Amino acid sequence: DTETKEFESSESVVLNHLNRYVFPGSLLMGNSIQDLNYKPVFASLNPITVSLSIPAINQNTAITITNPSLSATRAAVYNYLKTADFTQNGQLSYSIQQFSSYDELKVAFGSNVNSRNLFGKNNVEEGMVARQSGFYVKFYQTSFTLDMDVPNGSLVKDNNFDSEGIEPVYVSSISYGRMGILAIETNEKAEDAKRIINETFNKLFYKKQTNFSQEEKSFIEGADFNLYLVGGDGSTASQSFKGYEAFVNHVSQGTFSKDQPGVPIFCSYSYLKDNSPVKTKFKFDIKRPPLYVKLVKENMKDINFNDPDGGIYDNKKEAILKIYFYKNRSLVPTLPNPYINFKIREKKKKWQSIAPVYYSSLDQVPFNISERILTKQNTLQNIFATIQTQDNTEFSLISRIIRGGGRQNPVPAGFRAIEINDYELVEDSNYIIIKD
């Protein structure tokens, strides 16, 4: 049981192991950019004119690459920056979004990249956020950008090239600098997590401060972090840590220079055919995670109405039945999923006799048995739900035993009436029962 999700991207995050294919005019297979399995198309390329923008200082220029290539692009940029003003920290930006599956981070990367495998995932719970709440933070510093002009005709010189009948594409714009995508898992509630996360990032990443409150410090020390960073310091896979000082080192601004001016962090593509912009429509399915339910008795009351002078002892046991919902076996609370019908079995054991019957055990009583199933639905407002079994009360009778021999032989023995109700969850295809 999955959830299909569709998004469209005109821009892709450049993974650390692929930045060699990302430069202005880089000609690639039209079917190799969606899964980041870049396949260069070998062709003779014409000169290109690209606009170099340093948005942190609000400056722009125009460099020319006669023979498009990564080396010519590196040489062109440096030989401009070595004579011009540049930036140390670039243009900062971050965006905070909640997520439940690491497959949803595909959208943050703007491609059909195996995001869960990239973040160390890959039951379906393996690719699911474990703690109460999950948020990812896409933060980046843009040092400079390269944006091609529309070619005057074709970017290619000769149409004699092997693209395997696939209409090729070429890298038409690139943004350079440093980018991280930080997954955060907190047992805190989402409203509080989102606020604490925004507050701590405006402090460290933006303002470079570290005067966190104890609330924010406790959030950091108790949160699970998993970062994928694109940069000179970037790994090919994510990195899972759990530390404040580790949090402060990683979320901190990076530095740029004329010798290290930033790596390709995201890029856009055009078609070689008509020089039109490229946009991909993606579709991925999120396997719905399981629902765990536990039946519990609460507000339990054991009442004894005893008449030792008349040899009658009435013991009534009661409780409020309650089902609790969880997203995993670690009892992380969750709001129930819509349209699940929670089923509770009531097995009743009833017996009575006008005259005391001296059974040595309740396993000897000839009980009259009856069973029914209660059904609870539409409970999507709380991480638990009360199970009503009677009229005019949230309490359910667990036990009701009256015994005794009467005024004559006023012993606490014999049996006059027994009613015993046993309760359990009924197996369903939409939830897994947890019974202690």
SS3 of 348-379: the string is EEEEECCCCCCCCCHHHCCCEEEEEEEEECCC
* Token pair listed for 13: 């995050």
Same domain, 68 and 172: yes
Q: Give me the phi and psi of 209, to 5 degrees please.
A: -90, 170
Same domain, 205 and 316: no
Same domain, 147 and 265: yes
- Which of 287, 307, 336 lies at the terminal end of a domain, its last residue? 287
Same domain, 230 and 304: no
- Which of 252, 270, 287 lies at the terminal end of a domain, its last residue? 287
- Long-range contacts of range 354-362, CB-CB < 8 Å, 24 or more positions apart? 354/416, 355/416, 356/403, 356/404, 356/405, 356/406, 356/413, 356/414, 356/415, 356/416, 357/414, 357/415, 357/416, 358/413, 358/414, 358/415, 359/415, 362/418, 362/420
CB count, 10 Å around CB of 65? 22
Same domain, 144 and 120: yes
* Token pair listed for 1: 């049981």
Same domain, 225 and 372: no
Same domain, 263 and 304: no
Domain with 360 in it: 292-434
* Token pair listed for 275: 């020089």
Which letter does DSSP use for residue 198 in this model?
H
Same domain, 248 and 296: no
Same domain, 76 and 172: yes
**What is the tally of structural domains in the chain?**
2
Residue 288 near residue 396, CB atoms below 8 Å:
no
Rounded Cα distance between 96 and 133, Å, is 13
- Which of 287, 321, 339 lies at the terminal end of a domain, its last residue? 287
Residue 168: HSE in the Cβ half-sphere, 13 Å Cα cutoff: 25
Residue 296 near residue 324, CB atoms below 8 Å:
yes
CB count, 10 Å around CB of 257? 12
Resolution (angstroms) stands at: 2.5
Rounded Cα distance between 73 and 66, Å, is 10
Rounded (5°) CA angle 185-188-193: 75
Q: Residue 113 is part of a domain; what is its CATH number? A: 3.90.840.10
Write down the residue that tokens 């140390």 correspond to: 88
Same domain, 350 and 279: no
Same domain, 35 and 165: yes
CB count, 10 Å around CB of 424? 13
Same domain, 283 and 299: no
